[PDB]
Ligand binder design. Structure first.
Ligand SMILES: O=C(O)c1cc(=O)[nH]c(=O)n1[C@@H]1O[C@H](COP(=O)(O)O)[C@@H](O)[C@H]1O
Ligand SMILES: O=c1ccn([C@@H]2O[C@H](COP(=O)(O)O)[C@@H](O)[C@H]2O)c(=O)[nH]1
Lengths: 256, 256
């Protein structure tokens, strides 16, 4: 097992993965903030205050009541200042010809500001081929959704294996997974795990939580994605630091 | 087998399905236009000219370069005038808590103007529960993606069966399927089939085509969804009429 800093130098590493792994090592953070807010001002205030604590800020641009491309410009300023990647959790899941348009165009112009996006594998590899036509020239990366945190997820068994094969066959663009665990044995790939809180529980709409120690330490994932465990807390900075320290120590203790 | 007009009266029919089936029978159309354009003016000119020929206009609001809510008001005026449903092909595919916000909120406010949306079943039934918490109060309907037209689709076998079970257990909100074929034996459910052209072929990014006669007549689906077969033609009205007549006669001949 290699450190994040050594994985950043692997021969087959994608440049976006390398940039991420280097800043994870530098800042001692494997925390991705899930910035699940509806106001641009709250998004930017969280990005600025929590930027030093996070390796990545995950967006849902389509829930931002006051989205503009200028908001994204300000978020990029903070991402560059504090050193974190921007991941738009768009979950592209259409035919290749459609997702290329959804990624490059429309009002969001996601490819113009998102370092990372993700895709479901259920449509077959055309979803990746469509995205990569926009993303490769724009030097972007993609995560494939191999496992999901929600109750009744069908992303199990052969489905998960199909996601890993699709990633390993599109390594010029796919840099890792959304998963609950390590699903690829290739250290070039990132594993990002949502459904994370310190306390046991879930929500009323099928979300299930596991702890940072469980998903990083026992299940071998790289990065925790945390929304409400931070966002709903009174002090979001202290909450982010709790999650960062939990995920970082779980990583160190698996390393030895 | 019942006519569209008789299916509109079934005891368990959803009001959105009933409205659709009645206008399909009245206008002799089971064609859904896939309005895959980037200009509001082209979207509205197609909706106006092709409105009499279609039962439904399917949008990808996120590829419109000049989206505003006033464009959607103008589209609703045309939908009411010519009598067709608006279907936003958003393919919701996240946890329930997230999709409720993506459906109601953000810039697009999809639930405010879309009669129908669709969802992938891969996250489990929380995706439907989240949507239905916005959609039920707004008297909307949902389609579940049971099969996909693209090469390498994983929406087969047990996956398709899971989509049918999820639909039949959420019949207060789910009105049918995106599928390549009849997947439910319950006549209350609509089957809408994309990947349709008169000529054999595909695209460069995994799309596969079958004819209206194949998908309506042999595979037992209700509605054809047609994009490029119409949109890329010079005379889009004549193209829509050719697809309408093909799908309608295939339906009549299976009725006998
Ligand atoms: O839900 C959809 O309509 C959909 C499902 C599917 O299996 N395949 C599929 O192509 N679609 C959509 O249907 C349309 C097909 O367009 P054309 O290939 O140009 O006719 C596109 O807008 C797709 O996003
Ligand atoms: O399997 C997955 C993939 C994404 N997500 C997303 O991660 C976030 C989880 O937020 P939460 O910590 O508040 O439950 C939220 O934005 C979801 O849309 C999951 O929760 N599970």
């Amino acid at each position: 097992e290699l450190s994040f800093g050594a994985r950043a130098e692997l021969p087959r590493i994608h440049p976006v993965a390398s940039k991420l792994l280097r800043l994870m090592q530098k800042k001692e953070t494997n925390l991705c903030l899930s910035a699940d807010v509806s106001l641009a001002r709250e998004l930017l205030q969280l990005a600025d205050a929590l930027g030093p604590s996070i390796c990545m800020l995950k967006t849902h641009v389509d829930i931002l009541n006051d989205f503009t491309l200028d908001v994204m410009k300000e978020l990029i300023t903070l991402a560059k200042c504090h050193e974190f990647l921007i991941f738009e959790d768009r979950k592209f899941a259409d035919i290749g010809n459609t997702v290329k348009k959804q990624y490059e165009g429309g009002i969001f112009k996601i490819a113009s500001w998102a370092d990372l996006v993700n895709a479901h594998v259920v449509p077959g590899s055309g979803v990746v081929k469509g995205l990569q036509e926009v993303g490769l020239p724009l030097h972007r990366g993609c995560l494939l959704i191999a496992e999901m945190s929600s109750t009744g997820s069908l992303a199990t068994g052969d489905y998960t294996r199909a996601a890993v094969r699709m990633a390993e066959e599109h390594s010029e663009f796919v840099v890792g997974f959304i998963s609950g665990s390590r699903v690829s044995m290739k250290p070039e790939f990132l594993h990002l795990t949502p459904g994370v809180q310190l306390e046991a529980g879930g929500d009323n709409l099928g979300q299930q939580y596991n702890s940072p120690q469980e998903v990083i330490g026992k299940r071998g994932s790289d990065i925790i994605i945390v929304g409400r465990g931070i966002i709903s807390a009174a002090d979001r900075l202290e909450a982010a630091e709790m999650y960062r320290k939990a995920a970082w120590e779980a990583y160190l203790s698996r390393l030895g």
